């Protein structure tokens, strides 16, 4: 009884998507998987759906990270107003960023990318960066944020994703006098905007590949598992890094992204250091800069524990290689959206059913019923 998820091009293409260290290959919470010219550079190959940078400027401020980043200091404003958005104008006087997707389609041409995410990544990948200190052109690549509501593409000249600690930044104006307010990445689900954060390297090769290669969506009525003993066995309390209750599935979706063990390239140590300058837009690359490579607790199973009446978010850190179809369960990642897709259909006419071994008169049977994957227990003592 072989893993049917390797048994078919369509099943194998679907499972491959969830091999995150392979297909993404960089941090997810904070992505700093590359370095160039001495700076940490955003590097993952997969778009990160719903990723926003939460800021903490005092109440009167805009506190919107898609705001123009500052072009000059004002020593008299602490913290300095601004977001992460690249604020350069073209010599025509048109802004670099944000740009309407409409226009990008025009500017990329007849053979440009067929997805808004591919366009926005390519647009970033093509943008000639400029050192925010020396003021000289650089080979550094900016990350991007596509907003699927405004249909606008943003290129961020600020590539920093996580700034923390009262030595280095203010929360809501405390301590006072700090140049930078604090900030950290968060999954958001808002009706007003629908964000996708990515490195420019989404564009590299085929900018549209993410659609097919990456774990863009939650999987409905299925759990991530591991094939063993002729059966998909889902990850649960036994085999997870945490498995606390969640009030609802969206909370689980947010949790996996924010969880302390998610693949992340943030420095785990705190070098006694002076305050960042107003224009330290890019993290400096140090010999000890961590690279998760996208290994970590990046997957979450959301299910109703039959035993206890509670919904569980079971976050785990193994690459899964099958799905257990279970009605009402959801499989999430730190990369994907909370929007839900089905398991690939299944061909009932040819699909060969696979039987687990009999243990205590119950075996697990995987079949195709009405063209859908089915996993059930079956009595096997007469
Ligand atoms: C960078 O160029 C700007 C002009 O846009 C200038 O105001 C600033 O002093 C320069 N920064 C340097 C070279 O320190």
- Same CATH fold, 344-382 and 1-17+217-259+299-334? no
CB 286 within 8 A of CB 268: no
CB 132 within 8 A of CB 280: yes
CA distance 302 to 314: 6
Question: CA-based Rg of the chain, rounded to a whole angstrom?
Answer: 23
CA distance 236 to 85: 40
Q: What's the distance, Cα to Cα, between the start and end of the chain in Å?
A: 21
CB 373 within 8 A of CB 346: yes
Going from the Cα of 232 to the center of ligand 1, the distance in angstroms, rounded, reads: 60
Residue for token pair 């299925």: 222
Going from the Cα of 172 to the center of ligand 1, the distance in angstroms, rounded, reads: 30
CA distance 156 to 371: 45
**Dihedral class, residue 294 (left if φ above 0, else alpha if ψ from -120 to 50, else beta):** left
Enumerate residues 6+ apart whose C-beta is below 8 A from 60.
none
Going from the Cα of 132 to the center of ligand 1, the distance in angstroms, rounded, reads: 9
Going from the Cα of 69 to the center of ligand 1, the distance in angstroms, rounded, reads: 15
Going from the Cα of 175 to the center of ligand 1, the distance in angstroms, rounded, reads: 29
Enumerate residues 6+ apart whose C-beta is below 8 A from 185.
29, 30, 51, 52, 53, 54, 161, 162, 197, 257
Q: What is the largest CA-CA distance in the chain?
A: 83
Angle at 69 between CA 206 and CA 274, to 5 degrees: 105
CA distance 315 to 132: 39
CB 244 within 8 A of CB 305: no
Q: Where are the domains of the chain?
A: 1-17+217-259+299-334, 33-216, 344-382
Please report the sign of the dihedral spanned by the C-alpha atoms of residue 312, residue 21, residue 27, residue 203.
Answer: negative
By DSSP bridging, strand 340-341 and strand 218-227 are: parallel
Going from the Cα of 135 to the center of ligand 1, the distance in angstroms, rounded, reads: 6
Q: Spell out the SS3 assignment of the chain.
A: CCCHHHCCHHHHHHHHCCCHHHHCCCCCCCCCCEEECCEEECCCCCCEECEEEEECCCCCCCCCCCCECCCCCCCCCCCCCCCCECCCECCCCCECCCEEHHHHHHHHCCCCCCCHHHHHHHHHHHCCCECCCCCCECCCCCCEEEECCCCEEEEECCCCCCECCCCCCEECCECCCCCCECEEEEECCCCCCCEEEECHHHHCCCCCCHHHHCCCCEEEEEEEEEECCCCEEECCHHHCCEEEECCCHHHHHHHHHHCCCCCCCCCCCCCCCCCCCCCCCCCECCCCCCCCCCCCCCEEEEEECCCCCCEEEEEECCCCCEEEEEEEEEEEECCCCCCEECCCCCCCCCCCCEECCCECCEEEEEEEECCEEEEEEEECCC
Going from the Cα of 61 to the center of ligand 1, the distance in angstroms, rounded, reads: 25
Going from the Cα of 76 to the center of ligand 1, the distance in angstroms, rounded, reads: 19
Q: Which two tokens stand for residue 257?
A: 């992204």
CA distance 179 to 351: 63
User: How was this entry determined?
Assistant: X-ray
* Superfamily name and number for 1-17+217-259+299-334: Hepatocyte Growth Factor (3.50.4.10)
Nearest to 185 by CA among 130, 264, 112: 264
Going from the Cα of 71 to the center of ligand 1, the distance in angstroms, rounded, reads: 9
Going from the Cα of 136 to the center of ligand 1, the distance in angstroms, rounded, reads: 10
Q: What are the φ/ψ torsions at residue 307 (nearest 5 degrees)?
A: -80, -30
Going from the Cα of 97 to the center of ligand 1, the distance in angstroms, rounded, reads: 20
CB 298 within 8 A of CB 333: yes
Going from the Cα of 131 to the center of ligand 1, the distance in angstroms, rounded, reads: 10
CA distance 154 to 144: 5
Going from the Cα of 75 to the center of ligand 1, the distance in angstroms, rounded, reads: 16
Enumerate residues 6+ apart whose C-beta is below 8 A from 312.
236, 237, 243, 244, 245, 246, 301, 302, 303, 304, 305
Nearest to 377 by CA among 228, 201, 231, 211: 231
CATH number belonging to the domain at 344-382, selected among 3.40.1160.10, 3.30.70.100, 2.10.70.70, 1.10.8.60: 2.10.70.70
Going from the Cα of 133 to the center of ligand 1, the distance in angstroms, rounded, reads: 8
């Amino acid at each position: 009884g072989q893993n049917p998820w390797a048994t078919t091009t369509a099943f194998a293409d679907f499972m491959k998507r969830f091999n995150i260290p392979q297909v993404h290959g960089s941090g997810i919470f904070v992505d700093l998987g590359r370095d160039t010219e001495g700076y940490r550079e955003v590097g993952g190959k997969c778009p990160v759906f719903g990723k926003a940078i939460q800021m903490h400027q005092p109440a009167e401020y805009s506190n919107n990270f898609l705001d123009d980043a500052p072009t000059s200091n004002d020593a008299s404003k602490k913290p300095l107003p601004g977001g992460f958005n690249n604020p350069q104008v073209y010599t025509s006087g048109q802004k670099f960023s944000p740009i309407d997707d409409s226009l990008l389609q025009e500017r990329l041409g007849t053979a440009g990318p067929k997805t808004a995410i591919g366009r926005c990544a390519l647009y970033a990948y093509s943008t000639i960066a400029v050192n925010p200190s020396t003021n000289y052109t650089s080979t550094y690549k900016y990350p991007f944020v596509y907003d699927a509501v405004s249909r606008k593409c943003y290129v961020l000249s600020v590539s920093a994703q996580l700034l923390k600690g009262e030595k280095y930044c203010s929360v809501n104006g405390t301590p006072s006098g700090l140049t930078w307010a604090c900030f950290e990445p968060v999954k958001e689900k808002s009706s007003a905007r629908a964000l996708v954060y990515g490195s420019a390297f989404v564009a590299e090769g085929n900018p549209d590949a993410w659609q097919s290669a990456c774990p863009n969506d939650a999987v409905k009525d299925a759990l991530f598992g591991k094939w063993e003993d002729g059966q998909c066995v889902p990850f649960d309390t036994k085999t997870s890094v945490q498995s606390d209750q969640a009030t609802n599935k969206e909370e689980c979706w947010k949790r996996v992204f924010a969880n302390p063990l998610v693949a992340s390239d943030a420095p785990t140590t705190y070098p006694e250091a002076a305050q960042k300058n107003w224009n330290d837009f890019w993290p400096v690359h140090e010999q000890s800069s961590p690279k998760s490579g996208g290994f970590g607790a990046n997957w979450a199973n959301f299910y109703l524990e039959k035993e206890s009446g509670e919904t569980i978010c079971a976050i785990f850190d193994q690459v899964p290689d099958c799905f257990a179809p279970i009605t009402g369960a959801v499989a999430y990642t730190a990369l994907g959206s909370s929007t839900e897709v089905n398991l690939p259909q299944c061909d009932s006419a040819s699909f060969i059913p696979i039987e687990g071994p009999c243990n205590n008169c119950v075996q697990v049977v995987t079949e195709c019923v009405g063209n859908q994957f089915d996993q059930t227990s079956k009595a096997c003592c007469t």
